[PDB]
DNA sequence: AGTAACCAATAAATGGTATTTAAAATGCAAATTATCAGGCGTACCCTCTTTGCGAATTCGCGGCAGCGG
C-alpha cells in the first residue's frame, strides 16, 4: 500500500492534463479530476 | 229474404316465474422469439493549467471587525 501512494501521488499532473482536454463545458473541472484518478488508481494497480 | 245476446265453449290473448342447451366469443396466462443495456480492455510517449476575465465605474448605510492609546 505504502508503495503505491507514491506512484499515484506522483502521477496527478498527467490526471490533470488529460482531464483539462475534456474540461470543456462538462461536468466540472474537479469531478473530471477526481474520476480520472479512479482511473489512475487502477492503471497503477495493472501496470507491469 | 233474416231477427238475438242467450250460456258454453274454444283455445288464443298476453307477460310473466326458471334448469336447460353448448356453441360461440371473449377474455385470460404462458412460450418464444428480438434487442437493449452493461462490463471489460486498449502497452511509443505525453506530468499544476486550465481558468473566471465582470451575478461588472451604484450608492447609501450599518457593523463587525483590526490597530492604538
Same mark, same amino acid.
Given at each position: 500500500?505504502?508503495? =503505491?501512494? *507514491?506512484?499515484? *501521488?506522483?502521477?496527478?499532473?498527467?490526471? /490533470?492534463? /488529460?482531464?483539462?482536454?475534456?474540461?470543456?463545458? %462538462?461536468? &466540472?473541472?474537479?469531478?473530471? /479530476? &477526481?474520476? %480520472?484518478? /479512479? %482511473?489512475?488508481? =487502477?492503471?497503477?494497480?495493472?501496470? *507491469?
Amino acid at each position: 500500500r505504502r508503495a =503505491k501512494k *507514491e506512484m499515484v *501521488e506522483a502521477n496527478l499532473r498527467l490526471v /490533470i492534463s /488529460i482531464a483539462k482536454k475534456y474540461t470543456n463545458r %462538462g461536468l &466540472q473541472f474537479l469531478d473530471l /479530476i &477526481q474520476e %480520472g484518478n /479512479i %482511473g489512475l488508481m =487502477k492503471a497503477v494497480d495493472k501496470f *507491469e
